[PDB]
Subunit: 256 residues, 3 copies
């Protein structure tokens, strides 16, 4: 009891066409949001009834007098709706929320490798001491949409809530005195160091040209400005302030 559609020709093709209107044939009305345009439905005998065995649906996502917008839905026997393609082209697997081009509710296993754009940012060349834990940096650079290291000379602005890994280093001067730097939230070191869900640390150093370092790992909020510098001005005097990046840098990587 198959259904065959056979077409011979240079430009002709076979079509199964499912059409939907509201109203009647002589008085049709426009499709409304949520209306099903049509579906391919599979059903299987289990011994008692014809059970849902998957389906492929086209469903309106806008009233058609405004715009023709639809989604495609793929359902399986068992889980139900498994995949959705929205009118924007965004795809959801395991979710109907199609915010990004691909949205997976669950884990993803890839046998090969993944390439993508990665948000990261840097500051280079500590040129002066602005405030406790706030160096002024000679330049910044960044990639992606999560971090902005170029707008402000005194830090990197987090643009999106997320998890970040941060390392700041600066060279000690020639005095032989103990120096250190620390990563801070707009110069507030305790705001990061006191959290139970982060790593925050820093070392001391004294040998000329060696690094003191500070590290941070954890979540940050949109509009947070991350800074780094000496804890106090008198210690800043014993650190190297100059343009070359080898004198000191901050590096921020978006981890998730």
């Amino acid at each position: 009891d198959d259904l065959n559609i056979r077409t011979y020709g240079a430009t002709e093709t076979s079509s199964l066409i499912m059409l939907r209107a509201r109203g009647t044939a002589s008085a049709p009305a426009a499709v409304q949001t949520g209306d099903r345009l049509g579906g391919v439905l599979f059903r299987g005998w289990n011994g008692t009834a014809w059970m849902g065995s998957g389906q492929i649906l086209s469903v309106a996502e806008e009233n058609f007098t405004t715009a023709v917008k639809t989604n495609l839905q793929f359902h399986v026997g068992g889980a139900g709706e498994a995949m959705r393609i929205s009118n924007t082209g965004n795809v959801g697997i395991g979710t109907t929320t199609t915010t990004e081009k691909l949205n997976v509710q669950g884990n993803v296993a890839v046998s090969g490798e993944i390439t993508s754009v990665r948000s990261w940012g840097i500051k280079r060349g500590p040129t002066s001491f602005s405030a406790n834990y706030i160096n002024v940096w000679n330049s910044g650079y960044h990639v992606g949409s999560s971090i902005d290291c170029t707008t402000s000379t005194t830090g990197c602005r987090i643009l999106k809530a997320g998890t970040y890994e941060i390392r700041c280093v600066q060279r000690a001067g020639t005095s032989g005195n103990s120096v250190y730097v620390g990563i801070a939230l707009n110069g507030d070191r305790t705001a990061l160091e006191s959290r139970n869900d982060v790593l925050w640390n820093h070392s001391h150093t004294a040998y000329s040209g060696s690094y003191t370092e500070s590290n941070f790992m954890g979540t940050l909020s949109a509009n947070d400005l991350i800074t780094c510098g000496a804890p106090v001005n008198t210690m800043a005097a014993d650190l190297v302030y100059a343009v070359p990046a080898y004198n000191g840098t901050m590096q921020i990587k978006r981890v998730d």
Copy 2:
């Protein structure tokens, strides 16, 4: 000719319905595992035969008298089956094994950015010496499912086989002696360091408040306990043991 299904009105829709049973119309039997519920088949003349030119199948994944579980399969002329949606809603691309929500047998190329949960964990605040290469840590924290840094005070348990990048640092005290720490597998440094598929290193330091560092990068196994500490009890007396994380930390990131 084209097959058109046209539906008007407020409640109904156009539906191509494919139904499958075993036995006969008189003696219907339940669908069995591997039975095809139905399909949309595309065929094309190549001069010799009507060749497989793509198809969308619904197939039973279980005897329906047991459970109604189906998959949807998308095949193309050339590679054959290309994508599968199992009864769990899990999707395989280039593979029929749908362990996770999405599984890709191959590489993935993304033009934008990817957000997900990234497994990482930390120990902070080395407060006593437990054993060679094992500090007791005041607290731990972790994110995700691969690393457990809270159950035990003397290290982080690797919960999933994978690749990890680990850095451990600790401050020298005031003795002036050369000190160091090392990352180890439950106190066994050699079990990590002697492998030809890993990075393992460590530095010495002596300046008060300077950091001695140890690094590892490589695969670890489920149930591994990663520790870090001084190599012998006598050197521990020359390292800083106290609660604040700037005195010492261990950080573990899952890389793959």
Copy 3:
């Protein structure tokens, strides 16, 4: 009303079959590249016309007398074509250029975790000084396809354009003199350090067994050989050259 296909039996199934040939039934001719084999088309009334409301198409990608190759196309009302499955099985979401098994033209959002192969590589055991900023390394190791750290003893070769995070450390000897190492592009430090789109830094050290470190973050070109070493022979004499990896390493991770 609905179109029902129903089949009872153990061998056959219910199937909509769309067949395409060129020529005529009396003289059929092979399908040609670009020919539509068939489609499942949805259409909806918008007030004045039956508008395209999504469709699933099978389309030839090759002249069938050469080879049977098709793609499957998923179109929604609004964006038009949203997903392509090429004859290779490669899937494109928002792109028809299906270079990898899965290609996404946009961002990806995953609620869980992603596992994949990660390109990374290392060099261990600085054994001798080959030239400025080029140590010879006793061994290397790598995983993935972006980086080769074993073919050349003097560095890691970048095999794919990408963004890389690199850290090089080496132990100071016992001279008491200031020492440092630097990461370089086959010995050329300036080729990396002078770029406005990268991080490049290095520290000094003098304590025996402590690390001098150099760091890099940024894009690199295929065929780049990344080296690390002392800036001149007389400073190499003041660094530790020996086989154990704790004497010196280089670590490279592909970031994107």
